[PDB]
Amino acid sequence: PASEQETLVRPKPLLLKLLKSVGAQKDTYTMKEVLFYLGQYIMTKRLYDEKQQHIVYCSNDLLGDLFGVPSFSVKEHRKIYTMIYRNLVVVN
Ligand SMILES: COc1ccc(C2=N[C@@H](c3ccc(Cl)cc3)[C@@H](c3ccc(Cl)cc3)N2C(=O)N2CCNC(=O)C2)c(OC(C)C)c1
Ligand SMILES: [Cl-]
Numbered sequence: 001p002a003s004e005q006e007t008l009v010r011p012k013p014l015l016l017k018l019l020k021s022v023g024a025q026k027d028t029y030t031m032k033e034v035l036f037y038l039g040q041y042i043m044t045k046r047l048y049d050e051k052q053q054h055i056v057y058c059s060n061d062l063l064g065d066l067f068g069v070p071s072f073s074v075k076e077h078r079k080i081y082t083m084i085y086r087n088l089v090v091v092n
Pocket of ligand 2: 036
């Protein structure tokens with residue numbers, strides 16, 4: 001592959017369940033794809049605050065079970081990446 005910065009990942013089963021609900025089923029995804037799909041899952045389910053759309057409340061949604069937090073701001077990039085990595089493996 002041309003892009004040295006790309007990340008290929010294999011989601012854990014429950015992350016795969018989430019991704020399949022919003023997107024295509026694949027063996028391997030890229031990290032940028034996973035980020036995009038997670039955001040669109042949030043949009044599709046309206047997990048954000050309508051009057052503060054950069055805040056997400058996900059407790060007891062599948063997303064909250066995966067991330068292990070009840071809520072987060074989309075500005076919290078370290079948190080979002082680290083939680084995502086806790087839900088997949090990077091491909092060798
Ligand atoms: C002012 O309101 C905003 C501002 C930015 C984001 C956002 N920001 C993008 C983003 C966030 C964090 C990282 Cl680490 C990377 C990208 C991306 C995203 C990706 C993954 C997750 Cl878990 C959540 C959001 N993401 C989005 O998914 N957005 C923005 C672009 N188009 C959309 O339809 C939704 C946003 O997300 C909602 C889904 C809550 C809302
Ligand atoms: Cl994105």
